[PDB]
DNA sequence: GTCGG
DNA sequence: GCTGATGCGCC
DNA sequence: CCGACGGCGCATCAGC
């Protein structure tokens with residue numbers, strides 16, 4: 001795209017701040033500045049020009065000015081040549097290894113995947129799985145597979161109980177050619193916010209999907225949400241499919257469609273819809289949609305039976321998952 | 325790092 | 330054995 | 341000039 005050099009620089013600076021410096025806000029800033037520049041329909045000639053965009057401040061401008069003039073950034077070259085920084089930045093790619101564990105490993109002389117395999121005793125359950133499917137988790141999922149994966153989930157959910165309502169959200173629901181992982185939202189007439197659940201409602205779906213050898217491993221499981229690994233059935237004639245990340249979140253029926261809206265995305269869209277709601281005098285979150293009183297106090301949660309209901313409440317024209 | 329009170 | 334703090338991850 | 345910038349489910353560990 002236009003200004004591929006500047007965006008890469010910023011995204012590289014962002015990763016450094018998150019993984020090495022452990023400054024989450026600086027990371028979010030550099031990410032913000034990188035995204036707005038990526039959409040920009042020109043080629044930035046000066047830092048003063050880039051500063052006119054929202055999220056680009058004084059310091060990023062003086063960075064853009066340096067990059068365009070010199071070709072490479074003085075700071076990043078210092079980070080690139082640093083053994084500790086680059087090593088810490090690598091390990092954080094492994095699922096279960098955040099900045100904290102990463103630094104702890106590199107300080108103890110563990111820098112590469114070879115070292116992680118050699119020292120599996122020092123890894124937790126999550127990190128072991130993160131290492132096992134390291135390459136597989138960095139592969140994107142083509143829509144062709146996601147469709148085949150969906151059919152298995154929805155049918156196997158139907159196999160346990162007909163009353164279950166399974167909805168695959170994320171990029172896939174917006175109709176993207178490729179998706180990062182599978183994000184499934186589950187609910188049942190039995191489960192609501194007021195009247196609590198008898199457990200083994202999510203479990204039965206997870207236990208069923210394991211029975212048909214779809215779910216391979218488990219990263220985390222509890223009452224509400226589950227996180228683990230799944231694999232499509234080997235065609236036998238062809239080579240086996242790569243392992244994929246799956247998430248199954250069990251949500252109360254009354255606040256399902258409020259959940260479906262939030263987990264459908266995108267971030268920019270939710271941020272714009274939530275911003276408009278405040279202008280119209282309503283407050284929406286992951287869970288519920290509520291009215292803001294005269295004094296600016298949230299009332300009782302309003303009834304919702306679809307996504308349309310939320311769009312109606314804030315007198316907004318219904319947008320299809322394609323245009324999110 | 326950038327924004328807004 | 331319990332309860333709170335903290336790392337990690339989602340968009 | 342200075343505080344906000346994501347609140348939460350689950351796994352793990354510290355402290356009692």
Ligand SMILES: *CC[C@H](OP(*)(=O)O)[C@H](O)COP(=O)(O)O
Nearest residue numbers: 017023026059060063074075325
């Ligand atoms: C690149 C500009 C940085 O500003 P921030 O608000 O993190 C630094 O202040 C410049 O110093 P460097 O990081 O040592 O180059």
Ligand SMILES: [Mg+2]
Nearest residue numbers: 051052053054
């Ligand atoms: Mg600006």
